[model samples]
Target: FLTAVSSIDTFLPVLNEAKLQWPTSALAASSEELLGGYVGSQFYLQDGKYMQFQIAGSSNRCELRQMIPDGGSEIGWAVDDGTTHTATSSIVVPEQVDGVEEVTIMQINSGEAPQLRISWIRSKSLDGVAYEDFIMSTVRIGTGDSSDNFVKTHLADRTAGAMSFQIDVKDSKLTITVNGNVVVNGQDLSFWDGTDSCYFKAGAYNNNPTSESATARIKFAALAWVDH
Candidate 1:
């Protein structure tokens, strides 16, 4: 069951606070409908071409964080096994927020993900600036798939402007690449245990605690999902 992810190959869970659920369906065209004016009016199209999602800092919509969860605008592409899915895209990460821990960029989620997630994390800060690392975290622990159990590996550093990344899910093997650098190459993902409904998500899910009200303005460009 091990075959190369040929060119033919293609390719969240979590609810908002209000006890209501919002699917991260934030394409310029679909977002207006999903949010009835793009919900808090953050999701929109950039130059009427690239899709952009913006979320301001405030009280969390979901009780997941302190103040960073102000917005979680995203897009989900339904997926499955049998067919290998390869997703590649470039993202423009917003500026850093002081006292804010990390902000999500993309994810592979099912149920209450992320079975796998990539985010701009503060590797360190200088003076008043924060440099980030594009990291991948997974729920595939040696023990079990508890949402509480997550393991992470560094992929690449966050660059100014648009940064690119890729993820391939073939059978139970998962491969992730960032900025042309392969971070997780063919690692066994069988540990995740598939679900009846599986998909990929890309957006800004501001995570962690923040000292101030900061927003995450993220832009996704040249996104490709190929399936075989």
Candidate 2:
């Protein structure tokens, strides 16, 4: 039901590329990943928190994206899991990304944490972005329940180059695998089943704080999804 491309020829399938902004304290620069194949970005900020690109519309199908995170922090997407609340302002949460107003289904991050974070409602009608429950983050390669055990280890290899990351949903379970390896398998993601609708946010989300600006780079090769 949805298709997105990040090629030199096509760039991206969505409109308002300039208007599409990531929720961040950092700035974005289009530095082109490939000469004539892919589009990439370099994010700069003093205390860069997170950078994100919205994939408008909703879906329940498998989603895939080719990504590489270098000279930055972590790379992933803020997936809408079917839960949402209204926010009047953006100052409710610290380390919150920009442009997002409701809770996400999953905050898929690829880096040291090697895990997926949960987002929750902070207030009734405060404005701004929602907050992430990093306090209870699930480590992809740690000791915990079966869902936590499913992640054999952290996806450390992601730093080398762009890898194919896929997210699939089935029977209220969300599975995240990288380059064909099961990184996160069969966790209770019933949130996705609730709304029967969801969107995508992809980009570099830095966790470093500094007096001077820092840069985060990433390349997106493709984005595609199938409808249920």
Candidate 3:
């Protein structure tokens, strides 16, 4: 049984918050939809695209944010489904508020077109210090072929990449290198399945805000996935 069989790859689980869920009752702010898990008239994602998503609470409080990853550019984090690259940057208003948080998510492919990313920006005041939150992940898609419908069918379980320890925050940087004569240091040692390729970039999206928005920018390369 232990001859040479690779186990099937599963979904990469982020924090419990990463789960795609929205509220029912959400309000409108600057033409943005409101969403709350409490079954409020919260805004929900109908079409996946790079745009802004804002929502207002029952109190009519305005929550301005984006619908893509790292839309605010305040917090800094880069993610790509393609190849390993570095030094992609992003920034936000740097204002933080209690209970409300800004977020962004980035996606990319090695050579696939019609790429999609998620961003969530929020404009607001922090308890005094500017704060932003961000996350990154890969996206799955259809190939118009029944043979390549699911992840198990199209993509391969491989190493995504490594995040630079020092590269997170400029001043607050952390550095960790891989032990490889060919592999360089401070590189994102990642992997990708046989999915998207040829396209590469980073972007953001936002969520319900009290009165703020988010932003971001990212960089990455794309590689081809050749079959053996």
Candidate 4:
């Protein structure tokens, strides 16, 4: 009972062509603080690696992070499906990191699992290697907060948008706006704060460690960390 297979094939193409479109724009807000002018490194690290405070959501899935691991620096986060957290050395930033050239942060594309990473530049390569142990970092996204009142790592501030990257260089204080607005004179750049380093996981271990079920979407913008 094939009723005009040709007609069915012709109409199928039209059905597949249906789509929807939405248009929008983002604007960086003005800040109250004035950039004193850039110093040493023009930019900082942004790969969803390190945070001194808390982030939203916690579970046993992995989410992106921006990290700067001093070789041998004590660091660990919850593991997927495991009760006790495990120490990680994958995203450790070498102490040898010199003046940063550029800093970039991606929105990320979560495919079946949350994603996180940290990258930086170095002065001397180890046997031609650019950097050491400094690998991508992640944590469970559906579990506890990396800190109190802290939410998602990829989120902006309460009123203003989240900064893609911030740098404390020799002379200037630079911050980049991603979702909302970018103000050179925006509020003084800030990060999450932890209750106590001895009591809870704060600072670098903000985002809850990730699990096998964690995932994310790569639908955000990138911020440029330029020298002031």
Best by lDDT: 1
RMSD of 4: 23.3
User: In candidate 2, how many clashes are counted?
Assistant: 13
Q: Which stretches of candidate 4 lie over 4 Å from their true place?
A: 1-61, 64-70, 74-174, 179-184, 188-214, 219-228
User: Candidate 2's residue-wise lDDT over 171-209, tens digit each?
Assistant: 656666655666657766433333322333344333322
Off by over 4 Å in 3: 1-83, 90-93, 97-100, 109-191, 197-203, 208-228
lDDT of 1 by residue, 48-91 (tens): 44445555453222111101111444333333356786767787
Please identify model 1 stretches exceeding 4 Å from their true place: 1-41, 47-49, 57-80, 124-134, 142-148
The TM-score leader among the candidates is 1
In the range 1-228, model 3's lDDT, one tens digit per residue, is 111000111111111112222211142221111112211222222122111223323222222222222121212122333323222222221233443443333333234332223233333222354322422221234545452332211111112342221111111111222112211222222222333232222222334544442222221121111111
User: All candidates' TM-scores?
Assistant: 0.64, 0.40, 0.23, 0.19
> What lDDT does each candidate get?
0.52, 0.32, 0.24, 0.21
Which is the winner by lDDT between candidate 3 and candidate 4? 3
As a whole number from 0 to 100, the lDDT of residue 51 in candidate 3 is 19
What tens-digit string does per-residue lDDT give for candidate 4 at 99-139?
22211122111222222222222122433444432212122
Candidate 4 worst ten-residue window by lDDT: 20-29
Rank list by TM-score: 1, 2, 3, 4
List pairs with backbone clashes in candidate 1.
9-226, 10-85, 10-86, 10-226, 10-227, 11-85, 11-86, 11-226, 17-61
Q: Residue 66's C-alpha lDDT in candidate 2?
A: 26
